[PDB]
Amino acid sequence: GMYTNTIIKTEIDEKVIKAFKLDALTRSKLFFKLTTKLAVPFHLDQETFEETQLILFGSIVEDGEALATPEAINKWFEYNDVNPMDLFVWLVDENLVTLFKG
Protein backbone atom coordinates (compact mmCIF):
# COMPACT_ATOMS: atom_id res chain seq x y z
CA GLY A 1 0.00 0.00 0.00
CA MET A 2 2.60 2.52 -1.13
CA TYR A 3 3.04 2.02 -4.88
CA THR A 4 0.76 2.53 -7.91
CA ASN A 5 0.04 0.22 -10.85
CA THR A 6 1.47 2.46 -13.58
CA ILE A 7 4.96 1.34 -14.61
CA ILE A 8 7.84 3.59 -15.64
CA LYS A 9 10.86 2.00 -17.31
CA THR A 10 14.37 2.88 -18.47
CA GLU A 11 17.69 1.51 -19.71
CA ILE A 12 20.73 1.81 -17.45
CA ASP A 13 23.99 0.16 -18.57
CA GLU A 14 22.81 -2.96 -20.41
CA LYS A 15 19.54 -3.99 -18.77
CA VAL A 16 16.05 -2.52 -19.07
CA ILE A 17 14.76 -1.74 -15.58
CA LYS A 18 11.17 -0.89 -14.70
CA ALA A 19 9.65 0.25 -11.41
CA PHE A 20 6.23 1.09 -10.00
CA LYS A 21 5.41 4.78 -9.57
CA LEU A 22 4.75 6.17 -6.08
CA ASP A 23 1.38 7.44 -4.83
CA ALA A 24 0.56 11.17 -5.01
CA LEU A 25 0.71 11.61 -1.24
CA THR A 26 3.82 9.43 -0.96
CA ARG A 27 5.43 11.64 -3.62
CA SER A 28 4.41 14.96 -2.06
CA LYS A 29 5.67 13.94 1.39
CA LEU A 30 9.13 12.88 0.18
CA PHE A 31 9.32 15.93 -2.08
CA PHE A 32 8.47 18.16 0.89
CA LYS A 33 11.27 17.00 3.20
CA LEU A 34 13.80 16.57 0.39
CA THR A 35 13.39 20.23 -0.58
CA THR A 36 13.33 21.41 3.04
CA LYS A 37 15.78 19.06 4.77
CA LEU A 38 18.28 18.60 1.92
CA ALA A 39 17.83 21.22 -0.82
CA VAL A 40 17.19 24.62 0.80
CA PRO A 41 20.18 24.32 3.12
CA PHE A 42 21.97 25.26 -0.12
CA HIS A 43 23.65 20.10 8.93
CA LEU A 44 21.68 17.86 6.57
CA ASP A 45 19.67 14.91 7.86
CA GLN A 46 20.93 11.41 7.13
CA GLU A 47 17.89 9.24 7.88
CA THR A 48 16.10 11.30 5.20
CA PHE A 49 18.40 10.30 2.33
CA GLU A 50 18.38 6.77 3.72
CA GLU A 51 14.57 6.74 3.92
CA THR A 52 13.99 7.89 0.32
CA GLN A 53 16.23 5.45 -1.54
CA LEU A 54 14.82 2.63 0.58
CA ILE A 55 11.45 3.50 -0.99
CA LEU A 56 12.50 4.45 -4.52
CA PHE A 57 14.59 1.28 -4.88
CA GLY A 58 11.54 -0.29 -3.25
CA SER A 59 9.43 0.47 -6.32
CA ILE A 60 11.49 -1.80 -8.61
CA VAL A 61 9.59 -4.85 -9.91
CA GLU A 62 10.49 -8.53 -10.33
CA ASP A 63 7.66 -11.07 -10.44
CA GLY A 64 4.87 -8.60 -11.18
CA GLU A 65 5.38 -7.44 -7.60
CA ALA A 66 7.80 -5.02 -5.91
CA LEU A 67 11.22 -5.21 -4.24
CA ALA A 68 10.07 -4.02 -0.81
CA THR A 69 12.69 -5.28 1.68
CA PRO A 70 16.40 -4.28 1.61
CA GLU A 71 17.01 -8.04 1.65
CA ALA A 72 15.85 -8.06 -1.98
CA ILE A 73 16.98 -4.56 -2.99
CA ASN A 74 20.65 -5.38 -2.37
CA LYS A 75 20.22 -8.91 -3.74
CA TRP A 76 18.86 -7.45 -6.98
CA PHE A 77 21.69 -4.91 -7.16
CA GLU A 78 24.32 -7.65 -6.81
CA TYR A 79 22.83 -9.65 -9.70
CA ASN A 80 21.85 -6.98 -12.20
CA ASP A 81 24.96 -4.95 -11.38
CA VAL A 82 23.31 -1.57 -12.02
CA ASN A 83 24.86 1.64 -10.67
CA PRO A 84 22.70 2.75 -7.68
CA MET A 85 22.97 6.53 -8.10
CA ASP A 86 21.83 6.61 -11.75
CA LEU A 87 18.95 4.33 -10.77
CA PHE A 88 18.50 6.78 -7.88
CA VAL A 89 18.84 9.99 -9.92
CA TRP A 90 16.31 8.61 -12.43
CA LEU A 91 13.69 7.50 -9.89
CA VAL A 92 13.93 11.00 -8.39
CA ASP A 93 13.45 12.78 -11.73
CA GLU A 94 10.42 10.58 -12.45
CA ASN A 95 8.62 10.49 -9.09
CA LEU A 96 9.60 13.82 -7.50
CA VAL A 97 10.93 16.38 -10.00
CA THR A 98 7.77 15.85 -12.10
CA LEU A 99 5.80 17.52 -9.29
CA PHE A 100 7.82 20.69 -9.85
CA LYS A 101 6.98 20.54 -13.56
CA GLY A 102 3.23 21.09 -13.69
Side-chain angles (χ1 to χ4, degrees), residues 68-82:
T69 55
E71 176 169 30
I73 293 169
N74 292 311
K75 175 183 177 182
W76 184 91
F77 262 105
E78 193 178 353
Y79 190 100
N80 292 275
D81 211 325
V82 190

Side-chain angles (χ1 to χ4, degrees), residues 48-74:
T48 295
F49 171 83
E50 172 176 319
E51 179 181 351
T52 66
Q53 68 174 9
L54 188 147
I55 300 163
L56 296 174
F57 297 160
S59 59
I60 308 178
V61 299
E62 267 279 313
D63 300 305
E65 305 182 25
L67 302 182
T69 55
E71 176 169 30
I73 293 169
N74 292 311

Side-chain angles (χ1 to χ4, degrees), residues 1 23-25 32 34 47-48 52 79-81 84 101:
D23 286 327
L25 293 176
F32 183 66
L34 280 189
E47 170 167 17
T48 295
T52 66
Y79 190 100
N80 292 275
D81 211 325
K101 293 176 180 177

Side-chain angles (χ1 to χ4, degrees), residues 83-94:
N83 199 309
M85 292 302 295
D86 296 339
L87 182 42
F88 180 73
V89 164
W90 173 66
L91 278 171
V92 168
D93 284 325
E94 202 80 1

Side-chain angles (χ1 to χ4, degrees), residues 4 11 13 16-17 31 34 41 44 46 56 67 69-70 90 97:
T4 60
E11 177 182 356
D13 291 344
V16 52
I17 51 189
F31 166 74
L34 280 189
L44 327 185
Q46 190 72 14
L56 296 174
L67 302 182
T69 55
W90 173 66
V97 177

